[PDB]
Structure 1
Amino acid sequence: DVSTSELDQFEFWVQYAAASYYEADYTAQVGDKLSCSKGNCPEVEATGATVSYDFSDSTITDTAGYIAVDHTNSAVVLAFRGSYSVRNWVADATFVHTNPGLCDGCLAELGFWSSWKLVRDDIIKELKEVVAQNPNYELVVVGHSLGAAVATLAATDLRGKGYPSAKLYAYASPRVGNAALAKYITAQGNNFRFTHTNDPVPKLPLLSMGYVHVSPEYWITSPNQATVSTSDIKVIDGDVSFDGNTGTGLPLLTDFEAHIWYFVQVDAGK
């Protein structure tokens, strides 16, 4: 279980992930309000948060996102959306290790790391300016699904490039690296990683392939389309690799609908 306060926070940040699915948001003119035309980010809209910078998917990249500023919550928000071909990723993606240069022994999944590396230089330049304009604000890095994997790696790297207190909200994330990488990220702290029932996406890549999750795990145990209460989240410390969502069994495409329902229908904007 969690406190009401924590639940309210978790139900809030996911709405920035929801916004990242909307082409209208990630191609918005800078200064425009974030908005979700299907009504799945009402609390974001209530803050009046505006876009400071954005980046679109295109012919050269499947990753889209934005940097926004939330003057209600004193937060600079970096949101990532990854490929929306996620069923195909579960069915048929191949996973490859790479050395991201983050920590001793640490290896990351090449696809996810390559996605961050493509956008890193400009995002780092832009965050310097946005934080200079809002110098007492926190940095929150957020995503859902494949975007949550990119968010995890971005956060990890940003914490060594001037943002050590950056917060990560990674909803429905795949695993992103090996045991050494997971341990290093876990020790940075400020990590909020979520899974839902038997969602197959956080089960990949597999433990047997050497990949490990960041801990703790916030495991939402309520069903699809049910409101999450304080008793519907289990907090798992990662001491046992097969506690939590991994314990529900090998990943199945027949469980895929569980991927969509993390407090709200996160991907409605696609």
Structure 2
Amino acid sequence: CGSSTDPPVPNPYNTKEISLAAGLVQQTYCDSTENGLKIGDSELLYTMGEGYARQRVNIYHSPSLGIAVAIEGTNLFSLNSDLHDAKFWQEDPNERYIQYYPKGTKLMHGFQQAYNDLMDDIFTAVKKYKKEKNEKRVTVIGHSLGAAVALLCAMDIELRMDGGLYKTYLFGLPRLGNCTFASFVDQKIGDKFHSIINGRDWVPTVPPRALGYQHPSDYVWIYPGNSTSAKLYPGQENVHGILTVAREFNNDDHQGIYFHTQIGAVRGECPAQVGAH
């Protein structure tokens, strides 16, 4: 697999949508049982899971994003653990959807397993609220471990759900699949894929490329962290991007401010506060 040498370009992404999506996923770190909670322009419709065993998933309706699915990213397992452990092994796509993927696709076991525990509930709830809200757009959002799950979900929606995917917004995204997977993401949802990295965050560097993992094309890197200075680094694994500035192995920037919305996670803002910073 290659590494892009394209020079960085200005950030072209909608920063109001990023700010909104950041709040929608921060809220999944919070108790989300309140009827009709409003986050930004969006209304909370449904919540699944909790934090242990399975990631919390919130479903919203948004005038700008449509039916928005947001996936919590708590430490079900740790990404700073022994990399020989089975969590990090590459494996085939699950039988539910393997027929849609090109030969040779591989995914990280720990992330695929987490998505597989959620996918049938997500599909059932999304279809229900698309019908009830007369909404064709589906947006998938995730942070941290949840961003890798959300990337798999976004592909699953594009491949298997009638109407496909509208957009995906991914914060502090770990690597998820191999070279073949990464290029299939570009092919299927490249124009819909938004990966946002804050500051010195280390999570987008794991699992390592030495284990066969590869990011899809493009990310927007906020630097310095929590600022509004950001550029787009085109192509897969752009050599001019985050490794030019030493990563910090704590969660500070990872749980930082993304275009005025904090994703502080379990010790963040509950309820989430779109645009408050």
Range of TM-score over shorter length: 0.7 to 0.9
Counterparts of 1:81 and 1:239, CA distance in 2: 25
Q: Runs ≥4 in structure 1, deviation > 4 angstroms? A: none
Counterparts of 1:239 and 1:81, CA distance in 2: 25
Contact 2:197/2:221 (8 A) holds in 1: yes
Letter paired with 1:7: T
- Aligned-residue offset at 1:161: 1.1
Contact 2:79/2:206 (8 A) holds in 1: no
Q: Residue 224 of structure 2 aligns to a residue in which SS?
A: coil
Q: Is 1:51 the equivalent of 2:60? A: no
Match of 1:184 in 2: 184
Flag structure 1 segments of 5+ consecutive residues without an equivalent: 35-43
- The percent of aligned pairs where both chains have the same amino acid is 21
Name the structure, 1 or 2, with higher relative contact order (CA <8 Å, separation 6+): 2
- Aligned-residue offset at 1:241: 4.3
Where in structure 2 are the equivalents of 1:73-222 lying within 5 Å? 73=64, 75-84=66-75, 88-92=78-82, 94=85, 95-100=88-93, 101=98, 102-104=100-102, 105-162=104-161, 163-187=163-187, 188-189=189-190, 190-222=192-224
Match of 1:16 in 2: 24
More displaced stretch, 148-157 vs 61-70: 61-70
Counterparts of 1:198 and 1:32, CA distance in 2: 36
Q: Normalising to structure 1: TM-score of the pair? A: 0.81
Contact 1:116/1:150 (8 A) holds in 2: yes
Match of 2:254 in 1: 259
Flag structure 2 segments of 5+ consecutive residues without an equivalent: 1-9, 271-277
Contact 1:142/1:148 (8 A) holds in 2: yes
Where in structure 2 are the equivalents of 1:204-243 lying within 5 Å? 204-223=206-225, 226-228=226-228, 232-239=229-236, 241-243=238-240
- Aligned-residue offset at 1:256: 3.4
- Aligned-residue offset at 1:186: 1.5
Letter paired with 2:183: K
Distance 1:166 1:113, change over 3 A: farther
Encode CA deviations 1:73-102: one digit per residue, 9 max, x unaligned: 26111000022467x422446411111124
Q: Residue 74 of structure 2 aligns to a residue in which SS?
A: coil
- Aligned-residue offset at 1:103: 1.4
Contact 1:17/1:79 (8 A) holds in 2: yes
RMSD: 2.3
Counterparts of 1:252 and 1:154, CA distance in 2: 29
Contact 2:108/2:176 (8 A) holds in 1: yes
Counterparts of 1:92 and 1:123, CA distance in 2: 31
Larger helix proportion, structure 1 or 2?
A: 1
Contact 2:55/2:74 (8 A) holds in 1: yes
Counterparts of 2:17 and 2:106, CA distance in 1: 31
Letter paired with 2:254: H
- Aligned-residue offset at 1:14: 1.0
